[PDB]
Amino acid sequence: LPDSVDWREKGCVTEVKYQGSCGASWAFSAVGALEAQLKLKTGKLVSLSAQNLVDCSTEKYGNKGCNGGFMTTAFQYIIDNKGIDSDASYPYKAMDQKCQYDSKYRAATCSKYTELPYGREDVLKEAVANKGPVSVGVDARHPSFFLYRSGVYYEPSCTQNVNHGVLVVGYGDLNGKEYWLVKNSWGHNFGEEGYIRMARNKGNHCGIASFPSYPEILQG
Numbered sequence: 001l002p003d004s005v006d007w008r009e010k011g012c013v014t015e016v017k018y019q020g021s022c023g024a025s026w027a028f029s030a031v032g033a034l035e036a037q038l039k040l041k042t043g044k045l046v047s048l049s050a051q052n053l054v055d056c057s058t059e060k061y062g063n064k065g066c067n068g069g070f071m072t073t074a075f076q077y078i079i080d081n082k083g084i085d086s087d088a089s090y091p092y093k094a095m096d097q098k099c100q101y102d103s104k105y106r107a108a109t110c111s112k113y114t115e116l117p118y119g120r121e122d123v124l125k126e127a128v129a130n131k132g133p134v135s136v137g138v139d140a141r142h143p144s145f146f147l148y149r150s151g152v153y154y155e156p157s158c159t160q161n162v163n164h165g166v167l168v169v170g171y172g173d174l175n176g177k178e179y180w181l182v183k184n185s186w187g188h189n190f191g192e193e194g195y196i197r198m199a200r201n202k203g204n205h206c207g208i209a210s211f212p213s214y215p216e217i218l219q220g
């Protein structure tokens with residue numbers, strides 16, 4: 001295991017997106033994870049369509065578009081559907097729409113997904129290092145999360161119950177403060193150009209290791 005990981009250094013992470021007034025964090029978290037796999041497997045980095053997920057991964061997957069959902073079942077949709085469109089072809093409108101999936105513009109598939117054990121920050125570290133970015137939920141409801149600018153985020157009021165989907169794109173230790181490098185979907189003016197470093201190995205802080213999952217694209 002490397003001491004630090006940052007998947008942006010390997011070109012596996014697309015630009016930070018802006019979810020706006022639609023509670024579709026689950027979709028951004030899922031596409032973020034698959035984007036990294038697509039790049040790993042083909043060398044091409046392309047933004048995948050969060051909107052495709054909002055419109056099409058619905059009641060069969062327990063998802064409710066702009067009213068929330070789950071990364072795991074998002075990946076199952078991609079599996080069942082044999083594909084997801086590129087963001088460019090199926091752009092993001094921050095509102096529920098009719099499903100307009102078009103196989104003509106399918107940019108990625110998903111073979112399977114893996115859910116990691118609850119609260120196991122060691123296992124999360126291993127997956128981030130050896131597999132790629134991991135979809136996770138965090139407890140982001142606290143005012144300190146909204147005001148986060150820099151440093152390593154630690155909120156004594158955080159719980160292990162999650163309420164916002166994000167993407168772990170790495171980890172490190174900022175001068176004696178261990179962190180997870182997290183890509184949010186609140187645009188580049190949140191945190192450090194859209195990213196937040198969140199406390200690592202402090203008892204599953206903000207439930208970051210509560211419900212992790214990552215997709216895979218298998219080659220035979």
Ligand SMILES: CS(=O)(=O)N1CCc2c(c(-c3ccc(Cl)c(C#Cc4ccc(Cl)c(CNCc5ccccc5)c4)c3)nn2CCCN2CCOCC2)C1
Pocket residue numbers: 023025026061062068069070071072073136137138139140141142160161162163164165166210211
């Ligand atoms: C309450 S708990 O113990 O934290 N937990 C229970 C179990 C769980 C959970 C999750 C899971 C995974 C990822 C995410 Cl993003 C979520 C979520 C959520 C959520 C909850 C309440 C709310 Cl109100 C919201 C909406 N976001 C509000 C917000 C916006 C900005 C900042 C702060 C808050 C989202 C849940 N998977 N799982 C595993 C089971 C998933 N299946 C999927 C199929 O449908 C049944 C459950 C939640």
